[PDB]
Amino acid sequence: HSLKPWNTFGIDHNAQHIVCAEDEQQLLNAWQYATAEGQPVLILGEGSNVLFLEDYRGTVIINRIKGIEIHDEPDAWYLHVGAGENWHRLVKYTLQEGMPGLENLALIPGCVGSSPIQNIGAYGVELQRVCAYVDSVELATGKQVRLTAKECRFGYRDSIFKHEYQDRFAIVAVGLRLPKEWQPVLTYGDLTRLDPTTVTPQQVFNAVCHMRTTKLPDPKVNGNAGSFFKNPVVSAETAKALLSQFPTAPNYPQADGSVKLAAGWLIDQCQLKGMQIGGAAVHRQQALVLINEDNAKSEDVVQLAHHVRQKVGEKFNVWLEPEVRFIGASGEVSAVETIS
């Protein structure tokens, strides 16, 4: 009944059933049985991106479909990875096998199956960069389907799986394409200190992990779901109006002229680091991250998010949108709405 070991936030709510699907047939059967009993179904990889708001009235299927296949093409390595494979382990694996291209995405928690959902990205790379396709099983029909990287409609922490393909499909495998001709992505932070000629994949790996382990909390220590909010994209004007008064605001100018702001900075500027509500708190090393500091109740996390969002809204008139999926009793609910 407890979901606590199934979500990195460490939230303790219960589910009617929790089932591990070692293969697709198991996931499908589990889904069929639950929906026949009129129950809702939630598929989880590592629950490192979900906030359970209360007891779940249905079945939670832990996707553990494992296996990796490497297909060689003259120009690149094609990996067909089971949805249940651990992402970080895959990254280390690929590097170990001399198939670089995933190092910037090192240490990101979760399963491979969940990687396309919010287009995992960090340190200059997003999964869309190395994603070839994503294979799913249409839960209600059993029909396996494949979406090319383009048909996935990848965006900043976004994909078709968060919209049109949500719930209808269960991701069972992800295909990655790693060019044989490696080219390091050294555009982000401390990575710019490295030399594109001398640098090795492993060196980028370590550089990335160093920045991560110095800023992000390990869920083993304090439960968390990473960045709690997305970095907001404001219009070029709001950015004009904001950067004048707050000149040192980290901002990332967008294609269409709009501008992304660093949410962690906005929160930090509100002196929110270390702020706690109940057992939840704003991480002192990276304010964008809310943590389960001491037996946090989900409501502690919701109210802390609300406070953070409000303070940042009053000060910068920039309204933060959660990146974490909020799971209500019958399924995902509107996070923003929940923390409004």
Interaction of residue 8 with ligand FAD, rule CB under 6 A: yes
Interaction of residue 315 with ligand EPU, rule CB under 6 A: no
Question: Does the annotation place 56 within a ligand binding site?
Answer: no
Report d(CA 141, CA 169) in Å as an integer: 10
Residue ranges of alpha helices (H) inside 105-253 are 201-215, 236-245
Tokens of 204: 């980028």
Residue 252 backbone dihedrals phi, psi, to 5 degrees: -125, 100
Please pick, from the candidates 11, 171, 259, 291, the single residue that binds ligand FAD as defined by CB under 6 A. 171
For ligand FAD (CB under 6 A), the number of binding residues is: 32
Nearest one of 137, 134, 107 to 119, comparing CA atoms? 134
Contact status, residue 105 vs residue 87, Cβ threshold 8 Å: yes
**In the block, residue with structure tokens 């209600």:** 140
Q: How far is the CB of 293 from ligand EPU (least distance, A)?
A: 16
Which does residue 85 bind out of ligand EPU, ligand FAD, none, counting CB within 5 to 8 angstroms by kind? none
Q: How far is the CB of 115 from ligand FAD (least distance, A)?
A: 5
Report d(CA 292, CA 10) in Å as an integer: 7
Tokens of 331: 């399924």
Taking residues 259 to 298 in sequence order and writing x for each that binds ligand FAD by CB under 6 A, - otherwise, the string is ----------------------------------------
Please pick, from the candidates 19, 125, 225, 290, the single residue that binds ligand FAD as defined by CB under 6 A. 225
Please pick, from the candidates 56, 77, 123, 133, the single residue that binds ligand EPU as defined by CB under 6 A. 123
Nearest one of 66, 51, 89 to 290, comparing CA atoms? 51
Report d(CA 114, CA 134) in Å as an integer: 10
Return the SS3 of 73.
strand
Binding window for ligand FAD (CB under 6 A); candidates: 106-114, 237-245, 295-303, 304-312: 106-114
Q: How far is the CB of 287 from ligand EPU (least distance, A)?
A: 3
For the purposes of burial, counting CB atoms within 10 Å of the CB of 241, is it exposed (0-12), middle (13-18) or buried (19 or more)?
middle
Report the residue number, 15 or 157, with the smaller CB distance to ligand EPU.
Answer: 157
Catalytic residue among 157, 177, 309, 325: 157
Residue closest to ligand FAD, measured at CB: 45
Interaction of residue 50 with ligand FAD, rule CB under 6 A: yes
The string of DSSP letters for 57-111 reads EEEEEEE----EEEEEETTEEEEEEETTSBHHHHHHHHHHTT--S-GGGTT--SB
For the purposes of burial, counting CB atoms within 10 Å of the CB of 112, is it exposed (0-12), middle (13-18) or buried (19 or more)?
buried
Interaction of residue 13 with ligand FAD, rule CB under 6 A: no
Which does residue 30 bind out of ligand EPU, ligand FAD, none, counting CB within 5 to 8 angstroms by kind? none
Report d(CA 228, CA 206) in Å as an integer: 24
Interaction of residue 43 with ligand FAD, rule CB under 6 A: yes
Residue 272 backbone dihedrals phi, psi, to 5 degrees: -90, -5
Report the residue number, 64 or 239, with the smaller CB distance to ligand FAD.
Answer: 64
The angle, 0 to 180 degrees and rounded to 10, between the axes of the packed helices 201-215 and 87-96 is: 150
Q: Tell me whether residue 227 is one of the annotated catalytic residues.
A: yes
Catalytic residue among 24, 46, 293, 323: 323
Q: Which of residues 177-216 bind ligand FAD (CB under 6 A)?
A: 216
Q: Which positions are annotated as active-site residues?
A: 157, 227, 323
State the binding site: 188
Which residue ranges make up the site for ligand EPU (CB under 6 A)? 122-123, 189, 215-216, 226-227, 230-231, 250, 262, 264-265, 268, 286-288, 323
